[PDB]
Amino acid sequence: DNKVLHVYNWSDYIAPDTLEKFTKETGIKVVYDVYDSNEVLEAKLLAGKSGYDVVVPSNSFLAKQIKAGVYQKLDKSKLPNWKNLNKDLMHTLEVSDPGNEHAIPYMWGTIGIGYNPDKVKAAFGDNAPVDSWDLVFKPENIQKLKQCGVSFLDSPTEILPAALHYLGYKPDTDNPKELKAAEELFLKIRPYVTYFHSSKYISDLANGNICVAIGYSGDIYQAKSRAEEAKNKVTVKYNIPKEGAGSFFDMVAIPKDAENTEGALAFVNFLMKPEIMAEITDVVQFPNGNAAATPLVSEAIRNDPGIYPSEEVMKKLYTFPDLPAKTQRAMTRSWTKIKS
Template identity: 45%
Template sequence: MNKKHFWILALSFLALTACGKKEEPKEAAAPAAAPAPGANTEEKVLSVYNWPDYVAKDMIADFEKETGIKVNYQTFENNEALHAKLVAGNSGYDVVVPGAVFAKGQIEGGLLQKLDKSKIPNYGNLDSAIMAKLATVDPGKEYLVPWAWSYTTVGINKTKVMKALGSTPMPENAWDLVFNPTYTAKLKSCGIAYLDSPTEVLPPALHYIGKNAYSNDPADHKAAGEMLAKVRPHVRLFSSTMIDDLAGGKACVALGWAGDINIARSRAIENKSDADIQALLPSTGGLIFMDNLAIPKDAKHPNNALTFIDYFLRPEVSAALTNELSYPTANKASLAKVKPEIAQDKTVFPDAGTLAKMVAPSNFSNAARESLSNVYTAFKKGK
């Protein structure tokens, strides 16, 4: 057999062998592993919208370091500004901090989403007594987690106030210092500052004239406006920087929040100022307020928001806010970690008798807020 015939036969045999060989099945690619049930698959981003000077200095950085979630932290000056953002929609925020006075309307208006408490293991640290105070705002405890609480009151730089009053004694009711012309006429020389918001100024004014602090009656609002008009010439500032205004000496008397007044006191001490700043306890009571963590309905990162809320409810994290800013939280488990000098300060943690006199937070209807805004604008303009 010559070589040519040999190669023809060999090739034929190989071809027949190949045709008769069974092809091995290819191994199928393993399917991608599905995320574990309940796993957070959101991008590591969180947008927070809070009040100024209202977070412990290391909280955001520590949260980012532990979770890998980058926080975009911005601030607003009053409840009206936050509410406008939520009503407009597409705010871009995942966590907001509305006051109780606005929160009920935001819940009823569908602007906030229910909290998945299964993703907030530390929810049990909340004080049931404080949570009960939110019942008129969030009856089912489905939308809000308290961030901090305090009360609206009068703050003073005692040294300057005593000098300005001269022979006039301090009033029994601290509200007189900002609402009674007998006192405001004397105190205008060292500066009177009001919070710059209708829902912060009108409720204590209503309370002062014996009306329901959260009245929805326009006639009551008008009466409060008439009272305020008498002291308008004596008011120096409508302040969104109350802490600095008190600590820096721009005002000796303030209609403000006890927590901010106490921060101003600490800041003055740090700056070695001789300002003797005090939060007073009016004989007829201050107005309790509660600021609350909530998740907007259109939040893009609700799971990250729940992680943030749960992180804040750790005892040591909540206590850090109280220790640094003199604002109590609703975290009962944090009390053991609050500094003794702060825990014993009656202007931070009022005693039972003082608390009993204070007005609990409530809310206004949309129509009432418009009425309040009109009265406040006229007052501020001096009309």
């Protein structure tokens, strides 16, 4: 039975009936499981037998997982939709799957600026550089903002590069003297930071206990809506700094030990039909890799530069590397001193 497609994906990360539509156009029935963390999936692929034709791991893992011959290169000849992929994002993805050979971007997010336009304006004055990493990385700026509170993700592997990229170094630099600079910067601002956390800020941004939060885009939208919701006159805006930013994509790949290869490819191609990816996003509401899909996406999500960026910004976007041990704990030690 070659109407058997073994798929593996994030939970609630799909259309109401994407799989149907597929089947209806393939005559391939799909078995749809859903994992909840990269660790559980990564544990499958390594277990000598995936048993799946398609997984959608996070690009940070895809990278490593690529290096361990876990996937087969795509046979692009059988993916006539590939043209619909956003060339810009694909390019900013080469430093993860070189020559875009293995996966395509499903949906993605960024580490950017979550903020409250009103509180920022009253704490800062006119013209808060709310589109620029300047907002938080100039002492005389963040200090004014302490008065309404500002948060950073507790996560050095991601946050540091914000500093690095801000200082002009390469975001993935391995250099002791540079990482230090990054450290000396965060130290000039540390006294002006309420707290470091990867979750508290979501509600504090929504209740307006704090006015500036640097964190994940998905997280900031949660707050934004949670906020409109709470009918308490709190506004949550989100920006991707003109200087570009950190970014992450969930990638659809095909494992090397795939049983139904030729079906899986058909499947990936299916996912790039403008109106299908358009649909997936109307529902879960994270941007996707599909350029020619956009104009189909719901006016409200389509027109929100907080999700669909200048694409001059698109070009200034970066991924996160596979860091080497020395750096890795170099950062931890850094972060540790930074907090206290």
